[PDB]
Amino acid sequence: MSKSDVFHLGLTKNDLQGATLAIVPGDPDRVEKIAALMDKPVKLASHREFTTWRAELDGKPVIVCSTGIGGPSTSIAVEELAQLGIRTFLRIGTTGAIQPHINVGDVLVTTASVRLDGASLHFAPLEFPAVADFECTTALVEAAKSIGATTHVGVTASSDTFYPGQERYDTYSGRVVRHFKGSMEEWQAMGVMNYEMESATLLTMCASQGLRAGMVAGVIVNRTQQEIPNAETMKQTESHAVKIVVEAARRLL
Amino acid sequence: MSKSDVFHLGLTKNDLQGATLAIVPGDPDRVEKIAALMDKPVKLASHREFTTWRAELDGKPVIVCSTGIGGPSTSIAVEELAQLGIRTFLRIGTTGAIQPHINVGDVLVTTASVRLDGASLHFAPLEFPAVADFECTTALVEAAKSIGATTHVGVTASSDTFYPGQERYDTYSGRVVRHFKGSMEEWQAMGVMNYEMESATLLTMCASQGLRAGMVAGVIVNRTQQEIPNAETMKQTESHAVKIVVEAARRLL
Amino acid sequence: MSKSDVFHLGLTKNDLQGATLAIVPGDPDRVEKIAALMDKPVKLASHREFTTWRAELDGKPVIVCSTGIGGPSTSIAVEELAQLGIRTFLRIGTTGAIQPHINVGDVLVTTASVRLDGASLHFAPLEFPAVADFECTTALVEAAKSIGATTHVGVTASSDTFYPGQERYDTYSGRVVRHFKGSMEEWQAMGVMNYEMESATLLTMCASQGLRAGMVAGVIVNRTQQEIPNAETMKQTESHAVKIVVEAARRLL
Amino acid sequence: MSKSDVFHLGLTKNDLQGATLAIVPGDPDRVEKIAALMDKPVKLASHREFTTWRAELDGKPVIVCSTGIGGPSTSIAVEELAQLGIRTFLRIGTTGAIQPHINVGDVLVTTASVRLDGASLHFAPLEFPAVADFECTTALVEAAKSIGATTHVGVTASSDTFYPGQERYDTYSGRVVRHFKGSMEEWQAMGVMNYEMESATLLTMCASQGLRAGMVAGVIVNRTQQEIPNAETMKQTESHAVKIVVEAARRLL
Amino acid sequence: MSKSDVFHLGLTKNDLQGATLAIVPGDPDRVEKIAALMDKPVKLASHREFTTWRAELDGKPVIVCSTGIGGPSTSIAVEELAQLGIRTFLRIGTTGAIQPHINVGDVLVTTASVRLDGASLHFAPLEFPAVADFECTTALVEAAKSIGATTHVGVTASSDTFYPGQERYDTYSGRVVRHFKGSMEEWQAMGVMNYEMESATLLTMCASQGLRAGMVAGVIVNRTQQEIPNAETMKQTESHAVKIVVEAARRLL
Amino acid sequence: MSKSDVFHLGLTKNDLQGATLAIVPGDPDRVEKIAALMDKPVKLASHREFTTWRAELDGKPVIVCSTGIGGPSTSIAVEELAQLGIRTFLRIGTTGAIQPHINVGDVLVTTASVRLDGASLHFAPLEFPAVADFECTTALVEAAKSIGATTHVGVTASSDTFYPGQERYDTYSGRVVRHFKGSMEEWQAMGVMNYEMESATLLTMCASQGLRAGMVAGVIVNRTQQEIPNAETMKQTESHAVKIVVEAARRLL
């Protein structure tokens, strides 16, 4: 089993030009959406879950990509992006929250994540912290002040499966949960704001070399309040979190 | 209807018409190649990473869903099809072998996998075994012997990362994966036949009720005797497996 | 000096005479009853809890050598047999099923085991699966079916101690049952059929290569009732799993 | 469902006849050599690895039951005994020390044992000290002194199988372990005495309330020197340590 | 002083008056030197290891306290203080760099520590990140700006014992573990700047509703190169370091 | 203080005279106090709780030094002392018992410690027992029972926390406790008697090195039996545990 260099993504080094910055959301039907709030946004490729788009932001280029679900999908998009020339990864998602005071619509800026995945352990072992960059968390927290969004800074728990423990989640069971049942109220007490699944790998890769990674979200859901949130409200959440990371980036370029 | 909180697959119990058995491939591109050998192929409501089709096999609606990359997505889909009604699951994919007695074109059926990953642990302790099911496995060997293809029954090893370590495969050196500074010559000497990323996760999640999960793969590469992959081996090899999984699928109805 | 640093259990050289299979019950007082069922059954050697007899099937030699309790004895036995040349093993014992629908006078066939021993880890990491060989496992399924028996097949939990967890058993207490406290309800609900003590070792230390091992089992009791046991028919099930163990070897010769 | 699962091959309470101490050897033959030394020795029964004798000592009854191999069977012994009534257990066997200064025909006392087994984990966590009892030990040392043996009070390495060292001993290997080999000058640099198979387990099943478990071994070899054999010296070490144990035992009950 | 319920060497709820912010350095001398750059410096109680001074910054109650040595003392200092109402905790230290690009005089502010200590695990699972509060960390760097000192914000290693791995030290010949023995050269290739023994614990608590925490430490010596230091200057390293924490405390009352 | 080249908080052999023994309590106040019972007690030094008196007893200069809190301060004021030739240590302090049959004011003797701390692991792996040296340990009980002091010999849980497991221990709180939930009752049922912070690092360190380590202490609190204390205890137990340490080192010299 030999090979010849690589395969995946679609990028060529020369495409993205000399971008350096990368915004990596999860969902591919959201990459064009972010690239729109910018100038001269182009489609670069769409090689299965990994959807690239370029744009300029004040004369300076910025790459909006797509990662997929789970740490494994992410670690690929990132491994190849970092080699293409990228040294800054800004992520925007729309998570759900485990804290009662956190309302739907608010922003979440992840200083660091509780590692509950298995891909991150390939980069740096379960002792090294999954910590976000400082200029990256700064840009995003101050850029959210210049948008007027009740931002929440803190810890996010990124899992390898659709968020264990209690919670509620109409959890499909009968054979309950494994060594993860009472883990939900535990994190909840430890001031962990939200669950999610890709940062453990994003942050820990970056942290452990070059780096400058950061995560920004938007609570589209909270495991307690009913009707939360009405559809119109849900999507209105997805927008502000894009203005903030495109804006965060303008402050890093 | 569903909106926030869970949703995931564009699916409803109604849309399966019984099913109970679903063949789950890697890329969605492959699913339709499978859905060919069968009658009345209706493409079901796709989504990100997870496709879903339905078809006739001896007058029994059977279904074909893609699972995405690795275990996190693999688990999501399983977690979601099971609910709908699917009890039995068979996975097909083309991999490469590590034993120099398994030439490209040989059909590897898995009975048990080396749990070397993280999503499995959400479903069982490291200790429980991730084994195929007796009824399912049998059929795959029986089918395979009917088309006279070099079946090999054994163990597979599931990494939760893109075949890295030190058998020249992409992730990056320097740090490597700490507690496993030895692997290739140590999975070899144990009789592991090939390396992949969703196998463990699927077998472990199943031997819990859905206990009906087998796995067959097509050797498309092999490092130990690297040279033999001549012309488009990938053809016969990818097609042989698609005849076997549909044949096995019919024995289990 | 080595006064033959090995001077261990059993015969030496060609007393087997080409045999390559071996039914390894746990009791010595059963090595007689078994070989008696073959043709021309001669006694070969004897050591504590180690009795070997040579008998034959359809013109082939088949040895029947007992292994003793727990895994540290089992290890030795195996290491000796395969050294002398046996390549296939057939174990059969008697267990106490933990599932309700099982019931007495039923044969259980193990696809793989849930490793709660310690000796197996001297062979393989806790990731390597404790799995039964295919050919071997099938024969026991085709032997039982063709003898008039109710055969349940699946997973067994091999305990290094006379089963902890939290079931009916008495016990002196002290600290009571450590962090195995809820392991009963767990495995029970995860679909393990019963507990044994020598499976995880044998299975794991064969599944590598030169595996070829399987396990038969007569259900002498259930740990989920308030009705039986049968009384005189209990041993009567011994004489049931034995024709089956005898049948499987004739089929593997 | 009065499923008498009560006594996994053994005896009745009156059999014990008010016994409270019990010297637990390893094999049936060393039981009879031990109970030869006490008053009016009676064979109570013999079933599988377990041969129980009844003796007297200063008019006081002393159970002498054989453990078998490794910690698995031993745990059934101590647990069956205790159940019938023993509160204090003394272990005795022969051993080869790994410490250079530790000569042959040199008895060794074990204050604590290095885990490395697997059944103890069924009693107390790896964190918990598998420790000898205070009384049972001084009794042991107070005996070694009165017999004239160079006693080496200390710690012992107890792994229920092979001792991880690519040694001058004998290593049957095709494929072995995961992350081990630290049994060479490692456990020897930490000044450990011998290699057991039953101590870590005995000690931990006892130290966890209702202890009184001491162990003494007679050194028959020294892995770091070749000059040997010497006919009866091992039988004389067999004789050395057996007196130390019967004699120690008297001081206890 | 003991009393009813508790008296673990500290002071009263009143001596603090305002409480809220505390500056926590190691040695008790440093305390006297830190409060001196503030007015109304009152001494309170040097009750063993932890010496508490109270002063006032910009007109409000402020407190300096020594933590002790390592995570267990760091942990007793933070508990009794938090009980009295202290929310913010700043750490001023002097360190050694393992980065060849961080000469003396430099200032290192810490984002998150690698949890190679025993003290943190008492607070969160191993997966938890010991990261500093955004506020004190921004304040730190901004403070360290109004002085002009070259700062580096980053990942600090926190274990027990003085600088692990292999340094030009005196590894006393009485045990040291190989499972940590080689990683310093790993942590540098991981981009971690410096070592310490109190951070991992300080951070993992506080992060757990213990409210806020952040750390600043000047560079008095780099191992990577020899020519440094100018061992005259150093007085002023701690100087600016001591001025920086005051500035940062001011920005947080 | 310390020094540029390994030198650290202590002194020199040049003023140690006859090394070998050391009585290492907690406080810096205790040193002089225990020292005020020997012969020709002179003060020798004093740093962060590392006070040292080089007192005499029956002819031998029996140094009394201090460790401070936790394994890390200990390890230093232990390992550097060792380098001065103190190859035998006796630990004295105070402590809170957990068995309900232990009254405030009776010395406890630690045979070995449950390893709940992080420094120990640097001296030996978790499996190696934090075991106390039989010689030191024997003298200890000889002494207590000698003066009727109600000695208890047993295991001791050694936490790097402040005696975990919890109960109405009060504290800031919020998140109850980590996995030390009910950990205390699990230790009680498992017979452990008291909690402590540095017997772990000490017993372990000395146990795999030069050797010899002892550990006594007094009981001013029972974390169950509320009715503090036995008469008024506190200051009386200081005397009853300290006597034993001089009476007891006066057998090792």
Swiss-Prot record, chains A, B, C, D, E, F:
<dbReference type="GO" id="GO:0042802">
    <property type="term" value="F:identical protein binding"/>
</dbReference>
<dbReference type="GO" id="GO:0032991">
    <property type="term" value="C:protein-containing complex"/>
</dbReference>
<dbReference type="GO" id="GO:0005524">
    <property type="term" value="F:ATP binding"/>
</dbReference>
<dbReference type="InterPro" id="IPR010058">
    <property type="entry name" value="Uridine_phosphorylase"/>
</dbReference>
<keyword id="KW-0328">Glycosyltransferase</keyword>
<comment type="similarity">
    <text>Belongs to the PNP/UDP phosphorylase family.</text>
</comment>
<dbReference type="InterPro" id="IPR000845">
    <property type="entry name" value="Nucleoside_phosphorylase_d"/>
</dbReference>
<dbReference type="GO" id="GO:0004850">
    <property type="term" value="F:uridine phosphorylase activity"/>
</dbReference>
<dbReference type="InterPro" id="IPR018016">
    <property type="entry name" value="Nucleoside_phosphorylase_CS"/>
</dbReference>
<comment type="function">
    <text>Catalyzes the reversible phosphorylytic cleavage of uridine to uracil and ribose-1-phosphate. Shows weak activity towards deoxyuridine and thymidine. The produced molecules are then utilized as carbon and energy sources or in the rescue of pyrimidine bases for nucleotide synthesis.</text>
</comment>
<keyword id="KW-0963">Cytoplasm</keyword>
<dbReference type="GO" id="GO:0030955">
    <property type="term" value="F:potassium ion binding"/>
</dbReference>
<keyword id="KW-0808">Transferase</keyword>
<dbReference type="GO" id="GO:0006218">
    <property type="term" value="P:uridine catabolic process"/>
</dbReference>
<dbReference type="GO" id="GO:0005829">
    <property type="term" value="C:cytosol"/>
</dbReference>
<dbReference type="InterPro" id="IPR035994">
    <property type="entry name" value="Nucleoside_phosphorylase_sf"/>
</dbReference>
<dbReference type="GO" id="GO:0046050">
    <property type="term" value="P:UMP catabolic process"/>
</dbReference>
<comment type="pathway">
    <text>Pyrimidine metabolism; UMP biosynthesis via salvage pathway; uracil from uridine (phosphorylase route): step 1/1.</text>
</comment>
<dbReference type="Pfam" id="PF01048">
    <property type="entry name" value="PNP_UDP_1"/>
</dbReference>
<dbReference type="GO" id="GO:0006974">
    <property type="term" value="P:DNA damage response"/>
</dbReference>
<dbReference type="GO" id="GO:0044206">
    <property type="term" value="P:UMP salvage"/>
</dbReference>
<comment type="subunit">
    <text>Homohexamer.</text>
</comment>
<protein>
    <recommendedName>
        <fullName>Uridine phosphorylase</fullName>
        <ecNumber>2.4.2.3</ecNumber>
    </recommendedName>
</protein>
